[PDB]
């Protein structure tokens, strides 16, 4: 996968955000990180640097309630498609809105924040 | 504009990746003459059915498998020709395949795509894993039942776990077989040209699976609150008690059909079972049901009933189980092949000119 969004990935520790929108991932402005439209989906990349200092990934997939098939299903397959591009390093995690695991809402400092709407369907 | 196509056993399902539901739909036959050259070639699909009288009617694929490949070109050139109205040349195409396809199989329709169709590009895709995707899951256990064939699929983190899967030799062929034979027993006869679809439709409209088989039986011996009127093609309307709910229950009981296999919720929990201790309890939360044998009411309740039972009591069990569940596998097709990443899946024109058809074993897994 030449995805341009690929090559900018895992480079660094922290936190990269992307959006699906209309079957292609775009990057989520960092300054929005945290605000997830219920009616999307997105793909969320956490790189860890170990004590030793070696590179740990964590990739998450986020689920609106109102998300339609399209978006839940690209994020389910670009999250596969990260994966083997990050050489099946990641550990894939499922995370659906009001149902997330603890150390993803750990990743945001202030909290997540729910909010309606988002960009239509592809189909 | 790519193209998916999801070659059932039965059914063919095509249409146009982007699209939330397949285009066409038609019967995965072909039809040719019995006795050659003494009247006015082949037909597919309905006109093969309707004209069943005259054609010897053949399938060419069981169990998902092609068994005929001059009869499958006939089913494609009919879905491209006759159905979706495409020149093939000009469209990448998405293919789907069973579980278990034999390789020589896959390079065989790799082959057929490139230099029959001269098709620009195209991947093929494993069904179950399609179904999995389309309902927004990297992880979990595919009930998959069409047509021949059930069969359970375990999936990690975007891939099957091909040690795990297991099949079940009864699917809705066996289900329409046994209305048939159980509402003669009743007192009907379904003696016309029209009876398997008749029985077929009986199964559709109106079967449904028992939360508890015993309770539903008893209701039904006592009560006339379960029964319900099928009005046939001419018009007399015939009763339909207890075998609404006793076919499918053949599902979770193949000893009705007088068979020795587990039923699918033991077929479900065995598959499970031969997965590392670690993932189970993904799957078991995760229990996706596609096909259209799986469309019967009440299916889902029975299998978390099931499953809670074969499972210890501490258990998360979900099971995934939504209403276009029928199409799950083109869907989750028409899902893939319009992303952006897709260009980059697909076996090209020059790709396949270069390396040949067993290209298809590096580039599509
Ligand atoms: N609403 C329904 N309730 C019960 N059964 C149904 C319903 N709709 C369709 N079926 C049955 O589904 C069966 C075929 O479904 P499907 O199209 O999934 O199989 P297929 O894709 O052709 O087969 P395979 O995947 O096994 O090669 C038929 O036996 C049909 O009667
Ligand atoms: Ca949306
Ligand atoms: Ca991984
Ligand atoms: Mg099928």
Redesign the pocket.
Known sequence: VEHPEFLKAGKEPGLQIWRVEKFDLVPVPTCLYGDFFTGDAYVILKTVQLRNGNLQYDLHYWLGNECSQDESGAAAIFTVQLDDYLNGRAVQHREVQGFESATFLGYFKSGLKYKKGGVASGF | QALVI????????AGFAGDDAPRA?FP?IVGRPRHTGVMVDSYVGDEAQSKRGILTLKYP?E??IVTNWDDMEKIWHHTFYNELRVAPEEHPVLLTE?ILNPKANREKMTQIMFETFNTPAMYVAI?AVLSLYASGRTTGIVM???????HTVPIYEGYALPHAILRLDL???D??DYMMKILTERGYSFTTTAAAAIV?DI???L?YVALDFEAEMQTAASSSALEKSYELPDGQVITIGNERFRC?EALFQPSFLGMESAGIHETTYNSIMKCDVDIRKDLYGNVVL???????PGIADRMNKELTALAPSTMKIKIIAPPER?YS?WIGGSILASLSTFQQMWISKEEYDESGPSIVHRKCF
């Open positions: 999801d070659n059932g056993s039965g059914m063919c399902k739909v995965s694929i169990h998902g069973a069904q998959d039942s069409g047509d021949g064939v059930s699917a809705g062929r289900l329409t077929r199964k559709e409209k079967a499918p596609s096909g259209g044998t799986t469309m019967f029928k596998v």
